């Protein structure tokens with residue numbers, strides 16, 4: 209075993225924050241609102257196409273540090289080069305299909321482990337190994353406060369027109385979800401015209417009334433609505449899914465990664481992380 | 493048969509696994525049930541017993557039927573008779589876990605919780621039902637979840653909460669390990685079982701009941717008057733799920749994982765939840 213893993217992650221608050229280094233190349237010392245030291249790692253990545261050291265922290269970085277300490281491995285973290293989570297796409301109308309995003313980097317060896325809010329699904333599980341879920345959540349819908357839709361069955365979603373724009377993030381698990389089912393083909397035909405490069409851009413477009421509904425992970429959307437009281441979620445969860453650590457099928461770490469996640473759910477470590485990063489007050 | 497015909501163990505626990513008598517005139521299981529064998533004891537102070545043909549149905553039985561069809565195996569289903577889900581006694585496992593560990597069953601299908609201890613000796617499928625340690629109260633009572641300081645430090649509040657669980661299982665063991673004061677405080681409010689706890693809540697003798705999320709959601713969905721409610725799912729503690737237990741290194745695990753994930757992605761799991769678990773109380 210090399211024992212030094214290439215970790216790939218992705219910007220995705222509150223799971224992964226990405227901030228510039230200080231002038232001297234280190235990460236500013238910070239504490240959370242509840243007084244815990246914020247553990248920061250150097251993560252190289254694009255920032256606009258050169259790669260530059262940046263500072264990463266959040267729920268997923270805390271989990272990475274717990275895993276590395278428990279199993280005694282070392283690591284280097286980078287941000288996924290294309291900025292995507294990962295879907296499988298046909299190559300140049302060939303026979304071959306190829307994964308983009310973090311999935312593609314893990315399968316190619318550019319990464320040895322994905323530590324990110326990476327959705328567990330059949331499509332990805334065919335090719336990589338997932339841990340047991342480190343977070344249980346689902347899909348919901350973000351709108352500007354004052355926008356009235358019932359949820360995923362609303363006629364403005366099920367009978368789409370250019371008068372009500374809705375979308376998700378390109379090359380993500382939610383993209384897969386709507387492309388998977390022929391029943392959803394009309395919805396997908398609309399979203400494919402409007403899907404955004406990243407969650408943060410889609411969320412800003414909702415605030416700016418350029419995107420009318422954003423379909424995405426509830427653990428992210430409920431957090432965003434908790435900070436930005438002009439945004440709300442609607443419809444509860446219309447689908448339930450979990451996040452897992454991603455590894456190639458030959459990883460020597462996969463059994464102990466899952467055991468550590470299970471131990472951490474059962475002893476309140478995951479509760480601490482959820483309270484620190486994920487949970488928040490309702491607006492009023 | 494041979495390697496495609498699998499010994500499978502389960503455990504009666506409605507609505508996940510429901511056990512019925514077989515028709516004595518026909519001795520055939522019909523409707524949505526499948527045959528399941530039970531070793532029924534002769535009396536309470538004996539190891540003697542006799543196998544009885546029963547019929548089994550429920551949420552987990554329909555999962556088993558789908559896996560049987562999709563993964564292409566047949567099975568001989570039996571009900572565990574020594575223990576329940578799985579406990580280690582004197583370094584020996586009983587319950588459903590024991591049947592798998594000691595190679596009497598290829599898989600265990602039931603309301604069997606994925607945890608760290610069991611995962612050292614069996615392999616678990618992906619979770620097929622979400623659960624965890626949750627809280628039920630009468631509508632109007634205000635708490636967040638197990639880690640609420642109204643539970644951790646009840647004497648900071650007036651009057652102090654009365655709250656309990658069903659003792660001697662995984663819930664008490666978890667609270668004992670994680671929250672020593674809470675654990676010793678709640679022993680006075682131990683409930684003999686779920687049904688007793690619901691009555692205690694409804695009649696004002698108990699303020700909160702801490703127990704399995706899936707069980708509590710099911711009971712809340714069916715409550716007369718829809719007055720018993722659970723906490724929000726974001727506040728479930730030690731989130732996990734029910735999963736299928738297989739022997740370490742099982743050749744069936746990959747196929748079973750992919751099949752369960754396909755069922756989830758195609759909505760088939762949602763259909764089963766609506767069929768078996770979702771109740772009239774919608775909030």
Ligand SMILES: C[C@H](N[C@@H](c1cccc2nc(O)c(O)nc12)P(=O)(O)O)c1ccc(Br)cc1
Nearest residue numbers: 474577603604605607661662663664666703704
């Ligand atoms: C909430 C659950 N424990 C209860 C429970 C209720 C319903 C179904 C159950 N299935 C199991 O396999 C299991 O161990 N426990 C189940 P109980 O053992 O206290 O009655 C529980 C709490 C912490 C962890 Br660790 C595991 C289970």
